[PDB]
């Protein structure tokens, strides 16, 4: 689990969004596994606006923050899971690292801010849903 709080927005994995998130929906994309909802309180996270490919992510299944190198956001085939059938997920970045389903929501950050959140994994890989292209999160 996990979320990003920026301005009056809350960014979560679409598959983990609550009834309140869907009731206060701003934008969602199943192909990205992202959902953004509005909030009443101001958040304190800063979204990175950059092309970094190194950062640190939180892995709840290890209670550890791992430094990683990650690929640029791309369209990647993602196997079937409890929440989606087998499909291509867009804006996904991969890294060699540990991840389990419950690790979704873990933040990936670089020197500039939040880059994205854990969204996929398995086989010694971890995939992160990019949020740096969502410029409207800043205003
Ligand atoms: C983080 C992770 C590790 C291993 C396996 C998974 C599988 N998975 C894929 C997610 C998606 N974005 O398609 C939806 C929910 C889910 O359980 C995730
Ligand atoms: Zn950066």
């Amino acid at each position: 689990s996990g979320a990003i709080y920026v301005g009056n927005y809350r960014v979560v994995n679409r598959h983990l969004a609550t009834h309140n998130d869907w009731a206060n929906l701003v934008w969602e994309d199943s192909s990205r596994d992202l959902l953004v909802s509005s909030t009443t309180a101001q958040g304190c996270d800063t979204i990175a606006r950059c092309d970094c490919q190194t950062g640190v992510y939180y892995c709840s299944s290890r209670r550890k923050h791992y430094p990683v190198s990650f690929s640029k956001p791309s369209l990647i085939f993602v196997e079937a899971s409890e929440y989606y059938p087998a499909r291509y997920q867009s804006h996904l970045m991969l890294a060699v690292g540990h991840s389990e389903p419950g690790d979704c929501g873990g933040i990936l950050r670089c020197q500039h801010g939040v880059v994205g959140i854990v969204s996929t994994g398995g086989n010694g890989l971890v995939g992160f849903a990019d949020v740096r292209d969502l410029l409207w999160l800043d205003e």
Side-chain angles (χ1 to χ4, degrees), residues 16-34:
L16 300 179
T18 69
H19 270 35
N20 198 81
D21 288 319
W22 281 105
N24 294 286
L25 175 70
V26 172
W27 169 82
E28 55 83 19
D29 185 337
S30 176
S31 76
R32 294 178 66 153
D33 183 40
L34 289 184

Side-chain angles (χ1 to χ4, degrees), residues 53-59 62-70 94-98 107-111 124 126 128:
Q53 281 187 252
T54 63
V56 177
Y57 82 102
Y58 177 56
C59 170
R62 290 288 179 276
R63 286 184 192 128
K64 199 123 154 60
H65 298 260
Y66 289 106
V68 282
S69 290
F70 53 90
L94 302 185
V96 174
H98 181 68
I107 277 168
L108 170 65
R109 61 172 68 246
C110 68
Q111 69 185 99
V126 51
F128 309 97

Side-chain angles (χ1 to χ4, degrees), residues 98-132:
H98 181 68
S99 66
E100 300 180 28
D103 290 328
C104 287
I107 277 168
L108 170 65
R109 61 172 68 246
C110 68
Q111 69 185 99
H112 308 106
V114 179
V115 173
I117 51 180
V118 173
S119 177
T120 76
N123 288 331
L125 298 162
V126 51
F128 309 97
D130 187 52
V131 304
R132 307 175 284 186

